[PDB]
């Protein structure tokens, strides 16, 4: 019954709000000019970068920026982990599979929600207090200058779908519930959950976006864009492990990366 699916949608939305302090609706109001939120400080060069610390509370610069993304992904992983536990049935699955769904789901989710913080020209940072331009990121030196560009490219295409947070909450849950992750022990109870999430997503997109033809199909097709984003990024991490042997990846992050 649709009623059961609407209640699942409400539930997931509610946990989403509770686990992610910076929603897309807040990101959007910061990026456009609404009076509900306050304007960010903009970092577009190395000198405004240094003024960013005397205003916002935040070793060559490209490295230090990179340590900033590191720290933020660790935080996102913590938030995603908190959100996963709220998805009905997730905590009743085998503990090894729970680790496995998170291990592979977490980055596809990060890049999905990172799109919420992006327009074609840059990305919100520091809980929306800052805005780091796309071009300042693309001008970083040799290995670092091109770690964000693919994420911007995805976000521009993904943001065209015009999903709002109640859409994303269900979509994020579908991602984490992927029974095709390598090494899963009991694929079948995972798929039963994902099939219920997919029904909830489908209904949600139909009621929330009644005029957007086949949005459901186009949203799932976006799942291959995420997969390729993850693969390019880990090959880029393997370059930096060797060219800066003096730099430390956060242990939560290197465990996710196998
Ligand atoms: C560009 N931003 C926003 C965060 O944007 C992100 C970019 C990449 C990732 C994936 C990380 S990157 C890494 O080192 N390993 C991962 O899993 C996660 C977030 C900055 C920049 C400076 C300070 C704070 N925020
Ligand atoms: C969901 C995608 C994960 C990345 C969100 C983007 C965060 C930008 C950089 C943040 C610096 C990390 C310190 C805490 C600030 C949270 C930032 C934010 O959510 O805007």
CATH classification of the domain holding 77: 1.10.565.10
Q: Give me the resolution in angstroms, 1 decimal.
A: 2.2
Say yes or no: CB of residue 125 within 6 Å of ligand 2.
yes
User: Distance (Å, rounded) from C-alpha 170 to C-alpha 41?
Assistant: 32
| DSSP-assigned beta bridge partners for residue 118 | 123
User: Distance (Å, rounded) from C-alpha 183 to C-alpha 255?
Assistant: 15
The CA dihedral of 223, 224, 227, 232, to the nearest 10 degrees, is -140
Its domain, for residue 127, covers 1-258
233 is in an annotated binding site: yes
Q: How far is CA 222 from the centre of its chain?
A: 13
Experimental method: X-ray
Report CA(201)–ligand 2 centroid distance (Å): 26
- Each as own residue / partner, the long-range contacts of residues 226-230 (CB below 8 Å, 24 or more positions apart, any chain) are 226/107, 226/108, 226/111, 226/112, 226/154, 226/175, 227/108, 229/107, 229/108, 229/111, 229/150, 229/151, 229/154, 230/107, 230/108, 230/111
Report CA(34)–ligand 1 centroid distance (Å): 26
Say yes or no: CB of residue 113 within 6 Å of ligand 2.
yes
* Continuous H helices in the chain: 2-19, 24-32, 46-55, 61-85, 95-116, 134-138, 149-159, 165-176, 187-208, 215-243, 251-256
Say yes or no: CB of residue 127 within 6 Å of ligand 2.
yes
Number of domains making up the chain: 1
User: Distance (Å, rounded) from C-alpha 212 to C-alpha 22?
Assistant: 26
Say yes or no: CB of residue 124 within 6 Å of ligand 2.
yes
* Minimum-distance ligand 1 atom for the alpha carbon of 137: 1
């Amino acid at each position: 019954e649709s009623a059961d699916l609407r209640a699942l949608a409400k539930h997931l939305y509610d946990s989403y709000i509770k686990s992610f302090p910076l929603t897309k609706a807040k990101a959007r109001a910061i990026l456009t000019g609404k009076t509900t939120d306050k304007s960010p400080f903009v970092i577009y060069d190395m000198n405004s970068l240094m003024m960013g610390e005397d205003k916002i509370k935040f070793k060559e610069v490209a490295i230090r920026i990179f340590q900033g993304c590191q720290f933020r992904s660790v935080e996102a992983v913590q938030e995603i982990t908190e959100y996963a536990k709220s998805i009905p049935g997730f905590v009743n699955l085998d503990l090894n599979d729970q680790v496995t769904l998170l291990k592979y789901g977490v980055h596809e989710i990060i890049y999905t929600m990172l799109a919420s913080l992006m327009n074609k020209d840059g990305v919100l940072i520091s809980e929306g207090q800052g805005f780091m331009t796309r071009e300042f990121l693309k001008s970083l030196r040799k290995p670092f200058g091109d770690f964000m560009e693919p994420k911007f490219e995805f976000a521009v295409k993904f943001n065209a779908l015009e999903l709002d947070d109640s859409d994303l909450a269900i979509f994020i849950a579908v991602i984490i519930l992927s029974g095709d992750r390598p090494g899963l022990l009991n694929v079948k109870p995972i798929e039963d959950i994902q099939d219920n999430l997919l029904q909830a997503l489908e209904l949600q997109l139909k009621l929330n976006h009644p005029e957007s033809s086949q949005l459901f199909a186009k949203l799932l097709q976006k799942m291959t864009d995420l997969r390729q984003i993850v693969t390019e990024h880990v090959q880029l991490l393997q370059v930096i492990k060797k060219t800066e042997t003096d730099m430390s990846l956060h242990p939560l992050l290197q465990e996710i990366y196998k």
